[PDB]
Each structure stands twice: as C-alpha cells, then as structure tokens.
Amino acid sequence: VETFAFQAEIAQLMSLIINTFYSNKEIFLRELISNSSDALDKIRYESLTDPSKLDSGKELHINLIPNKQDRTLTIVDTGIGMTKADLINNLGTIAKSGTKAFMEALQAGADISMIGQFGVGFYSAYLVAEKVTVITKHNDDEQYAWESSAGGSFTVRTDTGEPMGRGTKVILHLKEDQTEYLEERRIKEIVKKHSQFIGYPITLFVE
Numbered sequence: 001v002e003t004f005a006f007q008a009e010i011a012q013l014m015s016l017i018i019n020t021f022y023s024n025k026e027i028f029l030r031e032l033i034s035n036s037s038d039a040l041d042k043i044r045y046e047s048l049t050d051p052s053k054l055d056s057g058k059e060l061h062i063n064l065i066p067n068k069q070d071r072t073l074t075i076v077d078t079g080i081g082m083t084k085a086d087l088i089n090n091l092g093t094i095a096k097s098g099t100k101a102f103m104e105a106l107q108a109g110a111d112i113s114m115i116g117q118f119g120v121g122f123y124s125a126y127l128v129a130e131k132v133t134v135i136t137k138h139n140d141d142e143q144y145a146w147e148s149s150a151g152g153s154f155t156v157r158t159d160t161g162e163p164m165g166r167g168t169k170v171i172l173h174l175k176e177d178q179t180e181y182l183e184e185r186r187i188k189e190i191v192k193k194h195s196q197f198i199g200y201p202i203t204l205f206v207e
C-alpha cells in the first residue's frame, strides 16, 4: 500500500467541504453521476475509431448500489476507467487549478453546489462520506484501489478484489447521520431532480 499526501490546495478543498455548514448535501450524487457520464463519453468516443476498446465490456451504464448493512452507497460505471497515474493525479482532474477557480468563485458569491463547473465535483463525496474508496480499471493498466478518509492523505494499492472489466466504482462510506442516501425513495428523488437527462441507463439496485 502506497500512501500519498494531497497537494495543499486539494487538502484545503476537502477541509472546506467537510467543515463548511451547507445543508444541500444531496448534490454529491449529481456530481458523481456526472463524472461517470464523462467517463462513459470518453470510452464511447475512443471506441468510435477503435472498437476493440470495448472488448472489456460493451455495455455503457451506471449502477447505484445502496447497502444498509455496510452503510455504503456505491456508484459503478463502465466508463474509460483510470490508470494508476490518473488516480495519483487527483483522479484525472485538474484539481489544483480547479480548486483555485472554485475558491475565487466562492468568494465572489457562488455556492458549493457549483463545484462541478470547476472540475472538482468528485470531492463533494465528502459532504456525505467519512471515507471514499475508488476501484478503477482502465484498458491500459491493472485494477487499482484508491482510498481516503481525508486528513491530508490517500492510499493507492493494486486491487485483488472482484475484477471489474473496465470502469470506475466509487464506494461512499456514509457518515452516521447521512444514511438517508441509502433509502430507495430518496435516491430516486435525487436522480429525478438532478440527473434526469443523463445519456446512459442508471439502475438503482434494491436490497
């Protein structure tokens, strides 16, 4: 297991997300679905000229999997996935510059729900999760697990878990007071409100 420090700006972003009073926490799901959609667009685009890119799975979709026993909400997509280098580089984001732009926007009146416009929407996971684990498989690499409970560091390891084929799985270990996001009607409400026009099937698993 390798342990890495977050860049200062990202640690700052995470601390802001964790400590700022902000009631509209539900936007985390919109942001994660949007990231999944972006990843799905990318593998679709690459497949247009190289069809073999879909040998690792032709179906392009998103699954939402609540688990009340483990207190986890998992978002799974069959998008392009991430290489180890992507994971280490802030999960394939320009998070340093994005965090800067987001901050400048906040000071200028904007609110936390606008986070996705700055390319750092992933970190909104920390509105509801005490720990986030990301399992990912890119065609050009092995399967990796990234994990962070914030506090300035993340880990990366080769994943010997269930093979994914291709894509990214975000496992949210929910805060004790955020278990509403495990309820079917709540998840349905949020997907209908914020993600009604996503261009891939979203399947909400039941328990």
Ligand SMILES: CN1CCN(C(=O)c2ccc(O)cc2)CC1
Pocket: 032, 033, 035, 036, 038, 039, 042, 077, 079, 080, 081, 082, 091, 092, 122, 136, 167, 168, 170
């Ligand atoms: C373009 N695309 C590349 C890979 N990505 C992911 O695999 C991914 C999927 C879902 C997330 O929540 C975060 C990252 C992010 C953006």
